[PDB]
Amino acid sequence: TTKDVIQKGISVVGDLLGVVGFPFGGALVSFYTNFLNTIWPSEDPWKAFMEQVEALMDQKIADYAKNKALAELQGLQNNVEDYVSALSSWQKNPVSSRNPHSQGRIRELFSQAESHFRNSMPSFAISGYEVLFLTTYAQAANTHLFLLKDAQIYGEEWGYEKEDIAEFYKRQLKLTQEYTDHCVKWYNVGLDKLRGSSYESWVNFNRYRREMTLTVLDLIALFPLYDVRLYPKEVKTELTRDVLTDPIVGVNNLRGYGTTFSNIENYIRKPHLFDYLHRIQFHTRFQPGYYGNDSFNYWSGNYVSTRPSIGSNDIITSPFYGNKSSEPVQNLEFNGEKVYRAVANTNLAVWPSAVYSGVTKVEFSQYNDQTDEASTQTYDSKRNVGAVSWDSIDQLPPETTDEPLEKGYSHQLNYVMCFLMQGSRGTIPVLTWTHKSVDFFNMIDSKKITQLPLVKAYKLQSGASVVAGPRFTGGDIIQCTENGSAATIYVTPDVSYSQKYRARIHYASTSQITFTLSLDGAPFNQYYFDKTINKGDTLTYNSFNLASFSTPFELSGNNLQIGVTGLSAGDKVYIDKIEFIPVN
């Protein structure tokens, strides 16, 4: 259910990934037309976003608050549409028809929309309804900020005063911090409100977490890239966070046999360096039916193997999950294949005073980006398979319904974990996914500013570790507590000639520090960096700083190592991303 808003959410993020940083005029206008058709066509989408959280929270917005919100949104729609039509004409029209008279038309259409946004935002954050208005606020906030950056692109062309463009920029910086912080604060409020002890509690908790990730968290992660002054070129970036699909179960009500909240939540994958699905070992067991005729085999447990990020080849194999096989083991390999879909069959046997159900068949759809072709691999219990009851596409829709699935999908399989039901009445499989934007090769683009998340490293050292991200960076981060090396990340240059680059680092630190960069073991850059937080502070938007290294360099190697020094006992440094700026 609610796949509609989930698709809109996934699509917007997918489209924005193409116009992030300083976009080319034609691309910007193209985006805007889809944007209007997706998010700003009528009040239906906004109403659906409200109902979405109401469904997750099992609460409703007071009708008065709901009606006003919808009213503001209708007005904002007109402002956005009037603005886009005009912007479209401006881009299309040559630098000749641009007379003082048309400049003032676009200038006031823009000022109106921007102003209307600041006036309306409070309506999507009324006391007591903050969490329920979250996806609506997120989408409105996004629009407001995306709109704002246009003033830095076309400001002078439109004939705005130097003072005006500057006021708009400072306003953009203030709002990027506020909107981001607002979303994370209430996201967490909602998350905690759903924590329970039962299996049913965890499904709700995790569904909220996944849906808020796709519609809110992924979105706010892009906000900083709207700063066309800091990002004067197109930006190549990726979202590294995990999302778990709903558990695969054959029955709607488990009558208390579902795995407990803590036995699921405490065992799912913890903050880890990025990796890829490599192999799966299926274990099968026989489930007898009370009358023999109604028996079936089912997936009882599993092993999972993943390969690390580029630069390392040693395969990581998971502990055993679930119950050992009573039947012959099945192994599926994925070497390089991208699993973009998983469809499952489940079956049930009704006993006098018990019901037994399990996953009997799983069909995986894979795409080989090397040999540009799709195919399927499947697990079959072999005895009484039943019907399909679970489709990943329902939870993780494609970015585009235009292209074929192997091209338009939004996520790929990263992990499989089997949980045991209470009193071991069965097995509950849980699947973890990662975003399609993740570049396996860690490729440094020669024309764009490339953002490289530290979790893409293949090797951590000196006691460095992966820590939960602050919810606004698109993924997890690296925590450094000691002086010395920290991480080694493998890099793939996209060109052959001696292209030069400048490096920038997005970090947080409790003290003044020194970052050192090495290529294949040789230092090439070392610089001093400011303290951004106090010991014990929680990480909010302003905790992070983005600072450049002085000197330019060439990528005469592949193994980039980041080292830190200047730490004292109790000092901590958090590293989010390293950026590469193509320089002449």
Curated annotation (Swiss-Prot):
Listed GO MF terms: signaling receptor binding; toxin activity
Instruction: Extract the InterPro entries matched here.
Output: Galactose-bd-like_sf (IPR008979), Pest_crys (IPR038979), Pest_crys_dom-III (IPR005638), Pest_crys_dom_I (IPR005639), Pest_crys_N_sf (IPR036716), Pest_cryst_cen_dom_sf (IPR036399), Pest_cryst_dom_II (IPR001178)
Q: Which CDD domains match?
A: delta_endotoxin_C
Give start-end ranges for the coiled-coil region(s).
Answer: none
Q: Which GO terms describe its biological process?
A: sporulation resulting in formation of a cellular spore; symbiont-mediated killing of host cell
Q: Which UniProt keywords apply?
A: Genetically modified food, Sporulation, Toxin, Virulence
Query: Domain of life of the organism in this record?
Result: Bacteria
Quote the function comment for this protein. Answer: Promotes colloidosmotic lysis by binding to the midgut epithelial cells of Coleoptera.
Which family does this protein fall into? Belongs to the delta endotoxin family.
Query: In the UniProt entry for this protein, what further remark is given in the free-text comments?
Result: Toxic segment of the protein is located in the N-terminus.
* Protein name per its UniProtKB record: Pesticidal crystal protein Cry3Aa
